[PDB]
Design an enzyme around this catalytic site. Structure first.
Site, PDB file in Angstrom:
ATOM      1  CG  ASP B  53      -1.850   1.166   1.215  1.00 31.12           C
ATOM      2  OD1 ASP B  53      -2.938   1.043   0.613  1.00 31.12           O
ATOM      3  OD2 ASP B  53      -1.483   2.209   1.798  1.00 31.12           O
ATOM      4  CB  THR B  86      -2.945   3.116  -1.664  1.00 33.95           C
ATOM      5  OG1 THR B  86      -3.180   1.702  -1.665  1.00 33.95           O
ATOM      6  CG2 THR B  86      -3.903   3.755  -0.690  1.00 33.95           C
ATOM      7  CB  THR B  87      -4.017  -0.268  -5.828  1.00 35.86           C
ATOM      8  OG1 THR B  87      -5.357   0.175  -5.587  1.00 35.86           O
ATOM      9  CG2 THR B  87      -3.659  -1.404  -4.905  1.00 35.86           C
ATOM     10  CG  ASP B 390      -5.908  -0.732   3.685  1.00 30.64           C
ATOM     11  OD1 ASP B 390      -5.744   0.105   4.597  1.00 30.64           O
ATOM     12  OD2 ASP B 390      -4.966  -1.325   3.121  1.00 30.64           O
TER      13      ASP B 390
END
Lengths: 521, 532, 527
Positions: B53, B86-87, B390
């Site tokens: 992440d 975040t990816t 997450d």
């Protein structure tokens, strides 16, 4: 200047190779260290001392590294070593070769993630496989444990002391079950204290029905020997303590100074008669002792010891079953030291020692180690440490497995049955794990010193037969040996966590694709 | 003319900032999509950290260039907003930066670029709400499974996802909470996650209640309580001081004993008053004295010291206990009421990884959820919670927003063309920015494909065509579709595949990148200052 | 991705300035040079003093010398430096302001840049303005082709050219000094003249007025023998290269004497040869000899023995100056010399010019001589050096005048009309070159302002009046009353200047500033 100013980066196949190389390094420095024919290694500590032990974990525990995945592997060791004790004699070594073949598909440009998927798929098949070929066993049968105990220790130097240790282990564990959890009692490896004393011999070392204190009597008159002692565990100090609230005193007449002096003395007396009121025999405190109190305890024919570690204290409490007290006025007869078959204070040679054994039903006890030298004995207890460890795990599970590679081959062809039934790209990874499994017995032969290829092939050829699952290898002959007669028998969970941990490494390592240093934070 | 520093202007810094942005993209371009490969950092002394992440990655990474921090700053807000993306998200912005500058790189006026860029943002979100699909008709758990397991991809746990999300969905559905009287809000971070190296994640267990990173106060004290008589008390337990400055001066010695007597008896009766209620479990963030321990064993009760306030705050919430900083009353006396007790079927401390942690089972007053993690090393565990951290987040948002977006990058696949035609709508010079905005927006599938290692253009072109085909013959109920894969290296219906993502993820993303791109593009000159 | 990489070694110390900031930077540098030079122009101008690296000094007004001595580090400055050097050897003074023309143009050029205006057009218009200037200039140009034997247009022009120099003390004389010098050595059949025919000779001492051109040649050599008589009336002259010694064939040559008589004949020959050439010159009938090379002390006396003074160790160029001034020849041999090759002159006399020094030799030739020398006397070495260059330069313009006999009254009137002539076009300009016009025209305006400022008068109150008169009147003969004379008729004031001088000057300037405008970027290596 852009990114982090002297923090290196790396990516891709070079990285993945580096981990594999680092991984491959990690195993081989230990690959000789397993087996009844294993080696035994001696180590140079940072701080001057000497440690010798076959248990790989401590060896790895004493290893400083810079490569991260290597440091990762290190932690992996202690976790299972914490978890199960032994098999770390193989645990990491299994991992690396699994990786070692794992890389063999990277140049196949195969995305590891799918190769991970088979690894996941592989594990459940292994887990299910093992349960199928697990062996339930009774727990009350002591002799079987000892064989199991011996089997688990027939890798360490206490091999020549198997019978004692097997008894030594068996008794110690047997007396540890905190039944206050109903029929779900738990044993704990934090009360089975291990005491190393120099001199003497392995044979001299023995399990004591209770606890030992490396102390001496505060005063001569107190008996160093009592048949049926009565014990009080005084968490509090036995002497006057400052008024916590920063109190201060202003006297005006002459006598008060002496008077207040007598008052603390009286406060001391005040405490004692409460103790003597319950007719105890023994005074115990983790704290210091008022000699003036000690005077009256001497007047009371009641023995006192001071400044003891808490850890031992509760074990002392657990030993005689009595419960610790910090409030002498609130002392309860329910916490009398009843159930102490004997109090004695011996001399090892330049040290007084406290003997409290023969409890009615001791749940706690310490083992007295009597050997050659502490580092020798330190090795001994490590062999004990695992030795007790698997036993309790056995008391968690009555299921047993033939380790020694026999189960391994059993797993392997089971997957081979699966692999040819499991068409697709993932098949080659799947059979890879099966083939990767094969190295552990291979190590044995290398540790034994026989024709590994010829032995293993005959071994694998042997275990293509469905009728026979217990065919393993004798450690010393290096010959194909069915396990039932040989008796090297293993608890299920041991090999479970082995495989369980083994895969987790790979996927964890297999995802790694880049390097970043210099966090400076 | 400035001391302790020069300046750079025009193309130089302009180009320089692009290099900064692109680098950061290249920093993380390999950690995205169901094939994402996690990152790891040897810190400086070996306390390494594997993680995929970026927000963690970015946060943990030293940065000196300003704009990079902006992206570094930007991601964390999205982390404070989403959890994944975040990816994706940072990759989006700099690419949005990348092509934008290229237009500027000839002559193009930045503010001219901004307006269409502004236009780009509003246009898409409006159409995406014209491309949204709502989950309510769909079975709750299923798409919850889907998006979670969709979120589970690119993570350490993607293989075991079905077990995981199934664990996850139960976890979140048990942490239902009634909000403002008009919302059933579900509080993030409410569930407790504890890392426990050792067994596999298969053996990692969900806690239908609360579990504690705590241990028993007294080895003499009991360990497992099958009862619900549970008290918490912030008030710490020590032999009380005079607590401000209240000096003790003695002219009559005969009373220090009783002074000394009462210094603990104040604590003693408080205990007995507490015990007179019959509460057998007490927790205390504050310190606990051994005198209380002794009475507590003599009470046979359960005592905990030194517990973090948040957890006991959650504890009171679930058990129905009343959080108590002290004893008192609306009248001066310190009393205690049983109504302040919390209730739960059983509380045990149990040894996981040779470590006894305290558990609380099945609070009757309010449902509680905790998750136990079992794994190989600390390295694997604390990363996997972040995903798990997450993991809930999106579900909350999914629970927060009865609305979903299909996963696997169809979004921009739809977006690219629709604005491309819409680019023609403007007729200014700005649509070129739109075309590049869409053109740059195409970044995602390419990022996925290279990490998945296939011919992206052909995939992307195939993606373009189907979506382009989805923009012909308005009989689109039999012509509008959505989906794409990497595992087979071919498009699909991620709608059929269940690859779904929460809408707001892309929603806030495109907004947040828009702002940053707006920020970074406007710069034309940097001035440095050497330190004093 | 983003990470450091090397394109050029020492990339750290490769600094680089680009575009307008670099542009103005050069302009900033340019103005300094301009402001360096502004004071150096005109009769009221004040000259500079340079200090040599080996500690020597030099005071001068010739900007070419000033810059030649100048050690800058900025590259564009060196371009200016050689620029002036290019102008000087091209024409001469005017260099007194040549660079000043450039930078003020550049200074205002930036004003256009400050208006964002692209240099390329700025390069464009000024050149057109330059062509505008010259075709206006030569139209209003006067000529001295129309003049009779040009005795005192040149004297005025020399007078003009020397008013900028400190030698103005008696410059009238030096004005005459040069004009005689040049007219003697000029090839009207060619419109050229070689400066080699001019021998500058300045020896310190005496007054400036003691500076005296010599219709002849002076020698920095005394008599070969001290007893030889200082004066010589007749000038039967011998010009020799072969030094008065035994000839020696320069191929590796040596004799191998064996016997007595071998020794004697050579010993006999040794003197016999000297008598031979001693006879040889004597038979030539010359009166005086001169040798480039050495003498033998013996035959020297023997040469003194026949009352035939000679000169030894005479430098090359001068010998021919002797030869041509005498009309004489140069013979390498004793035998082959005949009286016809002998030089003749009016007078030769060594001069004990120094009160306390060794002496000099002068040849007061009396016939026609295409070579000539000037003798300078004065009180300071640098004063000599200033005079030489000043004198040297004054020669050129007359030479320059020889090439073109059309001039204009100087004093700032000339270009003044041009900007007005330029300006009148600027209305029929059309666009942005229109701005370019007035820009350069405004740029051109500085030179008179330089004058009046150096005149201490209000520059602008001056020229504003100056323009309006040249606006009200059509006479382009009104410059700056530099010496405070209430007449602006510089034509009557006789302050005049050759067409080419300005013509090349500004035309030169334009091309340079074109390149100046032409560049945008520089990569300087770190020192």
């Amino acid at each position: 200047l852009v990114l982090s100013q002297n923090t290196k980066r790396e990516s891709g196949r070079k990285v993945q190779s580096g981990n594999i190389n680092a991984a491959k390094t990690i195993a081989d420095i230990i690959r000789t260290c397993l087996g009844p024919k294993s080696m035994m290694k001696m180590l140079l500590d940072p701080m001057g001392g000497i440690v010798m032990t076959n248990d790989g974990n401590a060896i790895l525990r004493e290893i400083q590294v810079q490569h991260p995945a290597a440091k990762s592997m290190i932690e992996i060791s202690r976790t299972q070593d914490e978890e199960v004790g032994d098999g770390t004699t193989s645990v990491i070594i299994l991992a690396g070769e699994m990786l070692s073949v794992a890389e063999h598909f990277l140049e196949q440009q195969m995305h590891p993630t799918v190769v991970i998927s088979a690894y996941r798929k592989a594990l459940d098949d292994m887990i299910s496989t093992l349960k199928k070929i697990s062996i339930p066993v009774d727990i009350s049968d002591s002799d079987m444990m000892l064989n199991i105990i011996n089997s688990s220790i027939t890798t360490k130097a206490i091999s020549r002391w198997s019978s004692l240790a097997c008894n030594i282990a068996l008794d110690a564990v047997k007396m540890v079950q905190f039944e206050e959890n109903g029929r779900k009692e738990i044993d704990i490896k934090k009360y089975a204290r291990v005491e190393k004393i120099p001199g003497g011999i392995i044979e001299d070392s023995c399990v004591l029905r209770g606890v030992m204190i490396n102390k001496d009597v505060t005063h001569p008159r107190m008996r160093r020997y009592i048949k049926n002692p009565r014990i009080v565990l005084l968490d509090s100090s036995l002497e006057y303590k400052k008024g916590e609230s920063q109190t201060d005193i202003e006297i005006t007449r002459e006598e008060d100074f002496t008077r207040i002096l007598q008052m603390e003395e009286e406060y001391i007396q005040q405490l004692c008669e409460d103790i003597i009121q319950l007719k105890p025999d023994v005074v115990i405190t983790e704290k210091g002792i008022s000699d003036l109190a000690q005077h009256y305890l001497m007047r009371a024919n009641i023995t006192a010891i001071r400044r003891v570690r808490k850890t031992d204290n509760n074990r002392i409490a657990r030993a005689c079953g009595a419960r610790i007290v910090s409030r002498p006025e609130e002392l309860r007869e329910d916490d009398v030291g009843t159930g102490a078959g004997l109090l004695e204070i011996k001399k090892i040679g330049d040290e007084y020692f406290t003997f409290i054994t023969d409890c009615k039903d001791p749940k706690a006890c310490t083992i007295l180690l009597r050997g050659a030298s502490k580092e020798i004995l330190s090795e001994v207890e490590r062999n004990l440490q695992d030795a007790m460890q698997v036993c309790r795990n056995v008391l968690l599970d009555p299921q047993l497995v033939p380790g020694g590679g026999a189960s391994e081959m059993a797993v392997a062809h089971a997957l081979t049955e699966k692999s040819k039934a499991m068409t697709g790209v993932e098949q080659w990874p799947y059979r890879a794990v099966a083939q990767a499994l094969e190295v552990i017995p291979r190590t044995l032969i290398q540790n034994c010193g026989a024709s590994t290829i010829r032995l293993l092939t005959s071994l694998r050829a042997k275990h293509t037969q469905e009728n026979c699952e217990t065919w393993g290898v004798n450690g010393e002959t290096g010959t194909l040996v069915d396990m039932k007669e040989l008796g090297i028998w293993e608890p299920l969970a041991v090999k479970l966590q082995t495989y369980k941990t083994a895969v987790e490494t790979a996927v964890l390592l297999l995802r790694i694709d880049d390097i970043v240093s210099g966090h400076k934070k | 003319l400035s001391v302790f520093g020069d300046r750079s202007t025009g193309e130089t810094i302009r180009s320089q900032n692009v290099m900064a942005a692109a680098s950061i993209a290249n920093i993380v371009k390999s950690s995205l999509g169901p094939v994402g490969l996690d990152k790891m950092l040897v810190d400086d002394i070996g306390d390494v950290t594997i993680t995929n992440d970026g927000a963690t990655i970015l946060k943990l990474l030293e940065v000196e260039h300003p704009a990079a921090k902006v992206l570094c700053e930007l991601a964390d807000l999205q982390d404070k907003e989403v959890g994944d993306g975040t990816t994706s998200v940072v990759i989006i912005a700099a690419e949005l930066l990348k092509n934008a500058d290229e237009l500027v790189k000839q002559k193009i006026h930045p503010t001219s670029v901004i307006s269409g860029y502004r236009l780009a943002c509003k246009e898409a979100v409006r159409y995406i709400n014209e491309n949204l699909i709502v989950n309510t008709d769909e079975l709750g758990r299923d798409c919850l499974i889907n998006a979670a397991k969709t979120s589970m991809s690119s993570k350490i746990i993607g293989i075991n996802g079905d077990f995981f999300a199934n664990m996850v969905v139960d976890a979140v559905l048990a942490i239902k909470y009634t909000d403002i009287r008009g919302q059933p809000r579900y509080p993030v971070n409410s569930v407790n996650i504890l890392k426990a190296h050792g067994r596999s994640q298969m053996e990692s267990m969900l806690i239908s209640g609360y579990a504690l990173n705590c241990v028993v106060g007294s080895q003499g004290m009991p360990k497992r309580i099958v009862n619900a008589k549970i008290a918490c008390l912030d008030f710490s337990l020590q032999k009380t001081k005079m607590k401000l400055g209240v000096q003790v001066v003695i002219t009559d010695p005969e009373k220090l004993d009783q002074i000394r007597q009462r210094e603990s008896d104040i604590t003693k009766e408080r205990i007995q008053k507490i015990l007179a209620t019959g509460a057998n479990v007490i927790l205390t963030t504050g310190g606990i004295d051994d005198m209380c321990l002794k009475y507590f064993v003599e009470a046979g009760a359960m005592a905990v010291r030194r517990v973090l306030k948040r957890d006991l705050k959650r504890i009171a919430k679930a058990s129905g206990a009343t959080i108590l900083s002290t004893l008192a009353n609306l009248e001066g006396e310190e009393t205690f009421e049983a109504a302040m007790l919390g209730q739960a079927e059983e509380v045990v401390q149990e040894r996981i990884c040779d470590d006894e942690l305290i558990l609380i089972k099945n609070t009757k007053a309010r449902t509680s959820a905790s998750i136990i993690l079992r794994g190989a090393n600390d390295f694997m565990c604390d990363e996997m919670e972040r995903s798990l951290h997450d993991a809930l987040c999106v579900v909350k948002r999914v629970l927060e927003s009865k609305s979903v977006v299909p996963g696997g990058g169809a979004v921009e696949a739809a977006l690219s063309i629709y604005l491309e035609n819409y680019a023609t709508s403007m007729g200014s010079r700005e649509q070129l920015a739109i075309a590049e905005f869409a053109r740059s927006l195409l970044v995602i599938p390419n990022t996925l494909a290279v990490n998945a290692a296939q011919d992206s253009t052909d995939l992307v072109a195939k993606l373009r065509a189907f979506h382009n085909e989805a923009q012909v013959n308005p009989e689109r109920k039999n012509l509008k579709w959505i989906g794409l894969d990497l595992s087979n290296g071919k498009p699909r219906d991620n709608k059929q595949a269940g690859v779904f993502e929460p809408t707001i993820v892309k929603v806030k993303s495109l907004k947040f990148a828009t702002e940053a791109a707006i920020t970074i593009l406007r710069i034309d000159d940097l001035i440095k200052l050497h330190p004093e | 991705y983003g990470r450091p990489f090397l394109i050029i070694k020492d990339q750290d110390r490769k600094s680089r300035l680009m575009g307008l900031e670099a542009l103005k930077s050069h302009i900033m540098a340019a103005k300094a040079v301009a402001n360096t030079m502004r004071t150096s122009l005109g009769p009221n101008g004040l000259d500079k003093m340079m200090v040599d690296k080996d500690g020597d000094v030099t005071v001068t007004n010739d900007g070419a010398t000033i810059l030649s001595m100048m050690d800058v580090d900025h590259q564009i400055a060196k371009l200016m430096v050689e620029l002036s050097k290019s102008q000087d050897d091209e024409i001469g003074d005017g260099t007194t302001g040549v660079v000043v023309l450039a930078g003020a143009l550049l200074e205002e050029a930036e004003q256009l840049l400050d208006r964002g205006i692209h240099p390329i057009r700025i390069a464009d218009g000024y050149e057109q303005a330059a062509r505008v200037a010259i075709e206006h200039l030569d139209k209003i140009s006067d000529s001295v082709l129309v003049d009779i034997k040009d005795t005192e247009p040149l004297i005025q022009t020399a007078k003009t050219t020397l008013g900028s120099k400190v030698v103005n003390s008696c410059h009238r004389q030096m004005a005459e000094i040069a004009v005689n010098a040049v007219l003697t050595v000029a090839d009207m059949e060619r419109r050229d003249v070689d400066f080699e025919l001019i021998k500058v000779e300045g020896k310190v001492g005496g007054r400036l007025e003691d500076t005296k051109l010599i219709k002849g040649v002076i020698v920095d050599k005394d008599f070969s023998h001290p007893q030889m008589p200082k004066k010589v009336e007749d000038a039967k002259i011998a010009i020799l290269t072969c030094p008065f010694e035994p000839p020696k064939p320069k191929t590796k040559h040596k004799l191998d004497v064996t016997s007595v008589e071998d020794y004697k004949a050579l010993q006999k020959y040794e003197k016999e040869k000297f008598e031979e050439m001693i006879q040889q010159i004597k038979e030539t009938g010359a009166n005086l000899a001169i040798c480039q090379w050495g003498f033998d002390d013996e035959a020297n006396h023997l040469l003194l023995q026949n009352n035939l003074p000679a000169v030894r160790w005479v430098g090359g160029p001068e010998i021919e100056l002797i030869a041509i001034a005498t009309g004489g020849r140069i013979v390498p041999r004793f035998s082959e010399l005949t009286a016809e090759k002998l030089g003749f002159a009016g007078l030769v006399q060594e001069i004990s010019f120094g009160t306390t020094k060794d002496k000099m030799l002068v040849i007061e030739q009396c016939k026609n001589s295409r070579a000539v020398t000037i003798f300078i006397r004065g009180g300071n070495k640098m004063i000599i050096e200033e005079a030489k260059r000043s004198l040297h330069d004054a020669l050129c313009v007359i030479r320059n005048l020889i090439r073109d006999n059309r001039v204009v009254y100087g004093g700032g009137a000339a270009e003044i009309s041009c900007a007005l002539a330029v300006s009148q076009e600027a209305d029929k300009c059309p666009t942005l070159e229109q701005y370019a016009m007035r820009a350069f025209a405004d740029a051109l305006e500085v030179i008179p302002m330089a004058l009046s400022e150096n005149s201490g008068m209000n520059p602008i109150q001056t020229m504003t009046e100056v323009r309006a008169r040249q606006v009200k009147e059509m006479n382009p003969a009104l410059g700056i009353d530099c010496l405070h004379k209430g007449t602006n008729d510089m034509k009557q004031q006789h302050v005049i200047e050759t067409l080419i001088g300005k013509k090349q000057q500004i035309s030169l300037a334009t091309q340079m500033v074109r390149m100046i405008l032409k560049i945008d970027d520089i990569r300087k290596p770190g020192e």
